[PDB]
Amino acid sequence: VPGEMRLASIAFNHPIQVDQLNSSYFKLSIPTNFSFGVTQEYIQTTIQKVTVDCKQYVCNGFQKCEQLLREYGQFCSKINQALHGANLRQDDSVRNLFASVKSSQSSPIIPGFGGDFNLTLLEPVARSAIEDLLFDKVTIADPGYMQGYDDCMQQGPASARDLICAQYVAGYKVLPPLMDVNMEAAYTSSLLGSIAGVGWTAGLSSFAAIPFAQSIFYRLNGVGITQQVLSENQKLIANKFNQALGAMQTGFTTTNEAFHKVQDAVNNNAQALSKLASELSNTFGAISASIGDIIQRLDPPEQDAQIDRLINGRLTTLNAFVAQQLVRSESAALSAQLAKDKVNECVKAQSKRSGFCGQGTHIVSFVVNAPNGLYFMHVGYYPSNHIEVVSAYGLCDAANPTNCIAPVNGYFIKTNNTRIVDEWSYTGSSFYAPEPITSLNTKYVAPQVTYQNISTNLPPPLL
Amino acid sequence: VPGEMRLASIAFNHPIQVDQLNSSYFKLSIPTNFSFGVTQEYIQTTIQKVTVDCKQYVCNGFQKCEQLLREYGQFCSKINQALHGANLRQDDSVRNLFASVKSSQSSPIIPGFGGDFNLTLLEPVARSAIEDLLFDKVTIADPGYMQGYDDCMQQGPASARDLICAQYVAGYKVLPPLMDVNMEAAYTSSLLGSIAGVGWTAGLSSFAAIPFAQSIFYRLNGVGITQQVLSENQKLIANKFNQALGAMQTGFTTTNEAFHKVQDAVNNNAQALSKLASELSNTFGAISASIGDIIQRLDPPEQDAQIDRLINGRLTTLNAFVAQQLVRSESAALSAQLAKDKVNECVKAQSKRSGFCGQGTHIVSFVVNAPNGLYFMHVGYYPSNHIEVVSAYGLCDAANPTNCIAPVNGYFIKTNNTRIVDEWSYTGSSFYAPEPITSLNTKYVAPQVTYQNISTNLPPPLL
Amino acid sequence: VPGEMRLASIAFNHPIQVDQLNSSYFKLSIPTNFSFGVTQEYIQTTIQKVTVDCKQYVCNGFQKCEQLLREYGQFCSKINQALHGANLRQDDSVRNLFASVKSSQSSPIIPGFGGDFNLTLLEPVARSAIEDLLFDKVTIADPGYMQGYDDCMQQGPASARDLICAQYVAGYKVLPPLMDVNMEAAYTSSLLGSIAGVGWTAGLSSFAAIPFAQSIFYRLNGVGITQQVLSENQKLIANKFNQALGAMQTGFTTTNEAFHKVQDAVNNNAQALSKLASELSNTFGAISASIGDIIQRLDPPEQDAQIDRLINGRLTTLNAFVAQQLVRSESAALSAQLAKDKVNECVKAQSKRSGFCGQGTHIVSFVVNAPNGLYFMHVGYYPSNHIEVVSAYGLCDAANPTNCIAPVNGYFIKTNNTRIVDEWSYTGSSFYAPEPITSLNTKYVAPQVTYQNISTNLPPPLL
Amino acid sequence: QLHCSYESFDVESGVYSVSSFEAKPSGSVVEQAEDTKIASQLGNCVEYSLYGVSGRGVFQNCTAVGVRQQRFVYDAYQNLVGYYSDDGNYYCLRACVSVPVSVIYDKETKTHATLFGSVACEHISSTMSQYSRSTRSMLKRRDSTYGPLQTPVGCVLGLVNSSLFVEDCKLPLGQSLCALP
Numbered sequence A, B, C: 001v002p003g004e005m006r007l008a009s010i011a012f013n014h015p016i017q018v019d020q021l022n023s024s025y026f027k028l029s030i031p032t033n034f035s036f037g038v039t040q041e042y043i044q045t046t047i048q049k050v051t052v053d054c055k056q057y058v059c060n061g062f063q064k065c066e067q068l069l070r071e072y073g074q075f076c077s078k079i080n081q082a083l084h085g086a087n088l089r090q091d092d093s094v095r096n097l098f099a100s101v102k103s104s105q106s107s108p109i110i111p112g113f114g115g116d117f118n119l120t121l122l123e124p125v126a127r128s129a130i131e132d133l134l135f136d137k138v139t140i141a142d143p144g145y146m147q148g149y150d151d152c153m154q155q156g157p158a159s160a161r162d163l164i165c166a167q168y169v170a171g172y173k174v175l176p177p178l179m180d181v182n183m184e185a186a187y188t189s190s191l192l193g194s195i196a197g198v199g200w201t202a203g204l205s206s207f208a209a210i211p212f213a214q215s216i217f218y219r220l221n222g223v224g225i226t227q228q229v230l231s232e233n234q235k236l237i238a239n240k241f242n243q244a245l246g247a248m249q250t251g252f253t254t255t256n257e258a259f260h261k262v263q264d265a266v267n268n269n270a271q272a273l274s275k276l277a278s279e280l281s282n283t284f285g286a287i288s289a290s291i292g293d294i295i296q297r298l299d300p301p302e303q304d305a306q307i308d309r310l311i312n313g314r315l316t317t318l319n320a321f322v323a324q325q326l327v328r329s330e331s332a333a334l335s336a337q338l339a340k341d342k343v344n345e346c347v348k349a350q351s352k353r354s355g356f357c358g359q360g361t362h363i364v365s366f367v368v369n370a371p372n373g374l375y376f377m378h379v380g381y382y383p384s385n386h387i388e389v390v391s392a393y394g395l396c397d398a399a400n401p402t403n404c405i406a407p408v409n410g411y412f413i414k415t416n417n418t419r420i421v422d423e424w425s426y427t428g429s430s431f432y433a434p435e436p437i438t439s440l441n442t443k444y445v446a447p448q449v450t451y452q453n454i455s456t457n458l459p460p461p462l463l
Numbered sequence D: 001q002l003h004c005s006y007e008s009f010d011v012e013s014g015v016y017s018v019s020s021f022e023a024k025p026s027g028s029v030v031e032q033a034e035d036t037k038i039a040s041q042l043g044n045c046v047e048y049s050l051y052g053v054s055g056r057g058v059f060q061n062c063t064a065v066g067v068r069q070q071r072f073v074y075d076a077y078q079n080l081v082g083y084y085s086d087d088g089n090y091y092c093l094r095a096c097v098s099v100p101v102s103v104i105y106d107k108e109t110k111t112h113a114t115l116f117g118s119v120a121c122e123h124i125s126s127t128m129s130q131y132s133r134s135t136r137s138m139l140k141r142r143d144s145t146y147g148p149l150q151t152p153v154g155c156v157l158g159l160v161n162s163s164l165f166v167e168d169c170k171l172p173l174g175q176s177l178c179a180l181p
């Protein structure tokens, strides 16, 4: 068998140290081998909706209780009103969210979408392969509605143990979801067809309708990778992208934090209902947990007193339950607002913000349905194999001090490339690759003391 | 009389389907008939401030309960401290918000503002016509302060039924608002005068001071509508804008969700006070709801026990009340932070973020005072009558492969206009209208395989 | 002695009024004397972690109570589980935050950093001079851990009064922080070395590694101050910046709101523990607060009843305590999410938003550790001495109506400078200073009716 | 009931829960060796007594779970789960089931309709033998002429199958169902 535990220190990973330099030039760290990757998150948008038949919960048709309960009948009226208002708010947060995920227009979805990109998210023309993995990995009890109640009833297996049948004993009712899973699938298929792309200016009006692969190349050029590299590596890029998505088939375990959050959203709903069920057997110092039995065993002067003790504790449990539901309903509404913002930023557009997706710039992201919420996947770009190079703040003509230039979305580096005879070269900011300096890569700027003086050859201006 | 209800399915509005195409050109969907519209929202910023004279609430100065209450005197001390801290936080959230809505500089406000734009938001040089509609549609009780307490008194009408006079029986006090409605009006008039403008870079230093109509045209050119169209349609644009604003006179009904939220902010405050009032008559199994009566009817050994039971339930109600106020105060503070961000994004600038405001890009928005909060109006742009056209990724010179161009904030489309002899034409991204391709509408780009090759005539470069 | 209080009206500071003008030109307000300043804020990220020894808080190992308590043993099991889940969430919010503050690379930190900038934030190669001021000004009790418990013991001073050693009487345990102070210091030193700068596009891959002073000049040119001014005033700029930072040595008083919030984060933690301690002496109508004494004085038929009354109230206090902790834990998690966004926007980049940070555009910000959270400092730019000048929407050649220009990141103003013979001049949008109009400061635009017609001399185009 | 809970003569339109139908008792079943013919009766909702244990519920013939000769099988919440009869057969006990009820109220036309939840229309009839409250006759003013209608959410009364498509009924029944006025 295994031995002793080992005490250990938590490692601190040190950042790569780039030397600070003085003077007119500086050291630059730039990646040479990017790799795609994916991150995931779960954002809850709703609370399961519940109502309670307060009269039935407190007693079960006993007439002595009904007479006694009338003195407290206004408590149940407050309980029902509070739950009803909570359920109305859950319905409104759902409709508000779906009104913004919808696009005015989209591409039709067909097989072979994305060319060389694999794209397993396509509907099985349904839900999706990924949504099916989420619903199958989750341990949630099979839903009611259909057939529902006849799985409570003796016309079924002796092994049913569903809390859902216990709803018809306890007076609970779980309300059906507002949207219907088929419409929910249609709303996220509309988002999938809006991709490719959100570029070309705003994108709230016109719809570009271009191939998915083309929109990816624009997003890669939007993070400072030069176009020359993108044309050379197109098949390589497609393969790395597919490998990043291939890992999604193994990602649905509880070690994946996003998946774990989905599982605990389900657990919280189940626990809230089970608490009410356990309290049906909880005496409050009353002689018995059953009202029919406590009536059967007692003379009426004592009987009424015992029942009132029992009624008051049952009402107190319902009041605590309502307060808990009101808190949870509010947090879900706020969480749904966060989801709405990510659909209108991270899904419908490339994001320049950092801090909001995977930590690798941003490139296209996708969203799928999950229990009680939305599940996001974010493709991202991860740098590796950084090298340090010499770089200059800008370049100027030594014969004419007013002609000066500075790179656009990239840097001027001392050349280390055998193809380029020019002393300086241009590179992308997300990927290292030299290129000749030309007017397409530069802008004219006011002169500055740190700019290098070029004694001879500069192509922009040639003179 | 009316018949049976009808079962129906919820409609799913399908997105316009734009065909996906392969090869070097693509189908483009673009609107041909924009229309202005408005959306609205209410963001609460405060909770009505309340304090409670805990000694007076529990008992009415009868001396037997005063002696008994001293054993519990520390509960009231905790109650007063908790409410006091909640009220201080409400005052700080207000001052923090108003410190950011203020502008260092603004235009004076005069009649005829906006030229042909109607501008019913102008102050009646006061509050505003819109604020008056909002405050009059709301059913809130007339405020205290002046004369206040003398409307409790017999020197007034027999028909008063105000809960505000009941404050002087129950020991409640509603504290006055921190700002004074006149200063609040001055803060939002300053925001109205900061419009025109927000553009021209910065706007965190210099103040453009240009006509409102001019700032609108810059915002319309900021969403990809070409300047040529804007000059042709100036009167048409003014009329559509005015129609969108004219609908605000009919917008104040409970079917308008934003208005409904204003009404329920008022209802929540009224209900919180009414709960304490109803509990004054609530016995806790005590012989009577009145302490003076229960003293009158009892020998002192029993009398003290009955009063103690009554006191404990009254303290419990106050404790629950304080907890409720602390929760509401916190949610209002968070809501006020959201309002602060919208004033510093959606009011003081055009927004590029989509998803926030009305769902139609963004153009100028306005804000007015509302009970316990701010009420926003967002003008937006809604596309209609979309048509599909042929478009190209870019153009190049067939005689010289290094000459390649791509459109700026627009698209190259095959010409369908009899006015233009050129094979290709430029259009805006928010509105369809062809124009000749000129250097103002293009940028030079690196060559790409999908660009069309032009056998003859291109003006940028001519060669 | 002092006299009577004085009633006063709250002042309303009126905005500077810039006159609205019609026609082809307009009045412009622009600052002439900028000054640096700072603001600060405290964002809490955690709740102190606490656990409570069930089979301890209720009774102190008395055997009569142990037998009685077993009937309620499931309450303590629920209490421990709830606290344990709250503590796990606090640990995850911390690890999530630190995973994003880290940079892949940084400059080494050396003395003399920033050239002429003073930068007292540098580590005393440790924590930092500012962090030490925060920890010393705060009144929080000395932590335990090491030695800890041996300061509870008689092997120590008679004057200890720590609530921390009262933990070992009451059964409380305060858990140690997850990260250690040294690793936390290392994470914020990594942020300090990532500055200078987040410009040059991207910055999510390559690392510029340039002097701090150079990155400041790029940020100043990013707010519309022209480069010509920046080179002339470099020493002046450094002095004004240092004065703004020098004020931080006097800013740690309770009149500073951000500092006050740090102090009350500490006070809330201390109060939560003190509440449980005070309840140990609170009888619930039981004959005594001590179980050993109530056993000593009573025959067992009465003794058990008295102890049960005492147990029930003690469990109720623990239940209320747990509910309070769950609420606070949630608000801290949301607050930590806000901190994460500011580190990935306001610290790692210049921000164009306004809103966040001090109200003066944005320039570099810094972050340091504070008890239970992060303390941010934001350097900002404050305009002063505004003057009004004549300005034009644009310029065109009167001899050739198709040649029209408009300023980039600045304005065209009528010249008021004796140095410039040209009728019009260019100025920055954040600072007033005339310059000749040249192609570097302009862009070509479509013609418009409000542009001025120049009869003779324009350099861009010369013709 | 709805009007009394809101203390008003004009309740806002919506879908509202109302108290559920209970169970309906059936004649007793008793076992206690030491009268006929009530030894078994599978079964609906017959009150019972088993060696002094009593309750009301439905019995079903089932498998055999451990342990035999302890006679009474229970769950973790101490609900009786099943029983060993002296005829040598294990039977299981499901207590009884109930029908949740809610109503659709249209304040503008002052009309209403109802929903029985997931119960299914095979257990629904024109009159009830349960019960809940003394009448449902206002529904019957139209529903004396119609069969119950099954829907994906559940069986309903006075709904009519119009097969219309509408964006918002202001009375959704959940799912894609919608209650047009």
Ligand SMILES: *[C@@H]1O[C@H](CO)[C@@H](O[C@@H]2O[C@H](CO)[C@@H](O)[C@H](O)[C@H]2NC(C)=O)[C@H](O)[C@H]1NC(C)=O
Binding pocket: A033, A034, A035, A243, A384
């Ligand atoms: C570029 O980076 C990729 C990372 O995706 C490298 O591929 C991995 O390299 C390591 C090196 O030992 C291997 O262990 C892995 O098996 C490789 N594959 C994967 C899928 O991780 C790649 O080698 C790097 N270099 C080049 C030239 O592409």
Ligand SMILES: *[C@@H]1O[C@H](CO)[C@@H](O[C@@H]2O[C@H](CO)[C@@H](O)[C@H](O)[C@H]2NC(C)=O)[C@H](O)[C@H]1NC(C)=O
Binding pocket: A118, A119, A120, A245, A246
């Ligand atoms: C990528 O596309 C390929 C086909 O081009 C598919 O991979 C196979 O799909 C079938 C259908 O489910 C499976 O039976 C095979 O086991 C798959 N091959 C594997 C896993 O090697 C699938 O559409 C996509 N696969 C991935 C991993 O993205």
Ligand SMILES: *[C@@H]1O[C@H](CO)[C@@H](O[C@@H]2O[C@H](CO)[C@@H](O)[C@H](O)[C@H]2NC(C)=O)[C@H](O)[C@H]1NC(C)=O
Binding pocket: A024, A401, A448, A449, A450, A451, A452, A453
């Ligand atoms: C490139 O040449 C220019 C010539 O103008 C240099 O600019 C001068 O640099 C000195 C260095 O101390 C300054 O004192 C002068 O004020 C600068 N001239 C002007 C007109 O501003 C520039 O430094 C040279 N580049 C390098 C790297 O030496």
Ligand SMILES: *[C@@H]1O[C@H](CO)[C@@H](O[C@@H]2O[C@H](CO)[C@@H](O)[C@H](O)[C@H]2NC(C)=O)[C@H](O)[C@H]1NC(C)=O
Binding pocket: B033, B034, B035, B384, B385
């Ligand atoms: C452009 O759009 C506007 C706005 O929809 C159209 O004007 C209105 O269209 C509605 C459609 O029901 C009519 O009821 C109104 O009478 C129209 N006029 C006004 C002033 O509201 C306009 O017709 C559209 N033009 C085209 C060519 O489609």
Ligand SMILES: *[C@@H]1O[C@H](CO)[C@@H](O[C@@H]2O[C@H](CO)[C@@H](O)[C@H](O)[C@H]2NC(C)=O)[C@H](O)[C@H]1NC(C)=O
Binding pocket: B118, B119, B120, B245, B246
């Ligand atoms: C549009 O502007 C007109 C004036 O140009 C105004 O409409 C009038 O406003 C006055 C003041 O309340 C009323 O007495 C008139 O009855 C209004 N006339 C009409 C035709 O409504 C007002 O500023 C704006 N009106 C609308 C509807 O937007």
Ligand SMILES: *[C@@H]1O[C@H](CO)[C@@H](O[C@@H]2O[C@H](CO)[C@@H](O)[C@H](O)[C@H]2NC(C)=O)[C@H](O)[C@H]1NC(C)=O
Binding pocket: B024, B401, B447, B448, B449, B450, B451, B452, B453
């Ligand atoms: C327009 O001309 C360009 C030349 O720049 C063509 O682009 C080349 O297309 C071939 C086709 O396989 C590629 O192998 C070359 O690599 C492309 N050139 C470059 C520089 O990448 C383009 O195909 C022509 N387009 C049309 C529609 O004829």
Ligand SMILES: *[C@@H]1O[C@H](CO)[C@@H](O[C@@H]2O[C@H](CO)[C@@H](O)[C@H](O)[C@H]2NC(C)=O)[C@H](O)[C@H]1NC(C)=O
Binding pocket: C033, C034, C035, C384
């Ligand atoms: C530029 O602004 C500064 C403020 O940043 C001003 O200098 C201060 O002026 C006040 C006027 O009452 C004096 O009390 C201070 O002693 C000044 N110095 C400071 C704060 O260091 C002044 O308005 C301008 N200074 C110039 C133009 O040199």
Ligand SMILES: *[C@@H]1O[C@H](CO)[C@@H](O[C@@H]2O[C@H](CO)[C@@H](O)[C@H](O)[C@H]2NC(C)=O)[C@H](O)[C@H]1NC(C)=O
Binding pocket: C118, C119, C120, C129, C242, C243, C245, C246, C247
């Ligand atoms: C500017 O920096 C100098 C040192 O670089 C500071 O001078 C001393 O700094 C130490 C530690 O910060 C203090 O203990 C001394 O009291 C300082 N001496 C004096 C005379 O100030 C100086 O404080 C810094 N000034 C500002 C405004 O940042």
Ligand SMILES: *[C@@H]1O[C@H](CO)[C@@H](O[C@@H]2O[C@H](CO)[C@@H](O)[C@H](O)[C@H]2NC(C)=O)[C@H](O)[C@H]1NC(C)=O
Binding pocket: C387, C388, C389, C416, C417, C418
């Ligand atoms: C324009 O230039 C004139 C002179 O260059 C400036 O006039 C000065 O204004 C200050 C402000 O009080 C006076 O103290 C000086 O005496 C004035 N100088 C002269 C020579 O008259 C003027 O401020 C400049 N700017 C504007 C906006 O007019």
Ligand SMILES: *[C@@H]1O[C@H](CO)[C@@H](O[C@@H]2O[C@H](CO)[C@@H](O)[C@H](O)[C@H]2NC(C)=O)[C@H](O)[C@H]1NC(C)=O
Binding pocket: C024, C401, C448, C449, C450, C451, C452, C453
């Ligand atoms: C500068 O000259 C042009 C003429 O080349 C003026 O353009 C006017 O443009 C408007 C379009 O809104 C036409 O309706 C006018 O007829 C044009 N005027 C003339 C005289 O042709 C432009 O307005 C002139 N700038 C100023 C400030 O007057």
Ligand SMILES: *[C@@H]1O[C@H](CO)[C@@H](O)[C@H](O)[C@H]1NC(C)=O
Binding pocket: A022, A023
């Ligand atoms: C960096 O450059 C400055 C410029 O004058 C110089 O004073 C300093 O000594 C240099 N630092 C070195 C050489 O370490």
Ligand SMILES: *[C@@H]1O[C@H](CO)[C@@H](O)[C@H](O)[C@H]1NC(C)=O
Binding pocket: B022, B023
């Ligand atoms: C689209 O282009 C590809 C690339 O050659 C070609 O194989 C295919 O037949 C084309 N047509 C369609 C309908 O995909």
Ligand SMILES: *[C@@H]1O[C@H](CO)[C@@H](O)[C@H](O)[C@H]1NC(C)=O
Binding pocket: C022, C023
């Ligand atoms: C602005 O210009 C128009 C143009 O005719 C003129 O009628 C109007 O009076 C001007 N405004 C003022 C305030 O003079």
Ligand SMILES: *[C@@H]1O[C@H](CO)[C@@H](O)[C@H](O)[C@H]1NC(C)=O
Binding pocket: D061, D062, D063, D064, D089
């Ligand atoms: C059910 O009971 C029948 C007699 O009614 C019996 O024959 C059968 O074996 C039982 N089913 C079992 C034990 O699965």
Ligand SMILES: *[C@@H]1O[C@H](CO)[C@@H](O)[C@H](O)[C@H]1NC(C)=O
Binding pocket: D149, D150, D151, D161, D163
């Ligand atoms: C209702 O109408 C639809 C229309 O297609 C039909 O398919 C369905 O069978 C009808 N009946 C029910 C019970 O839904």
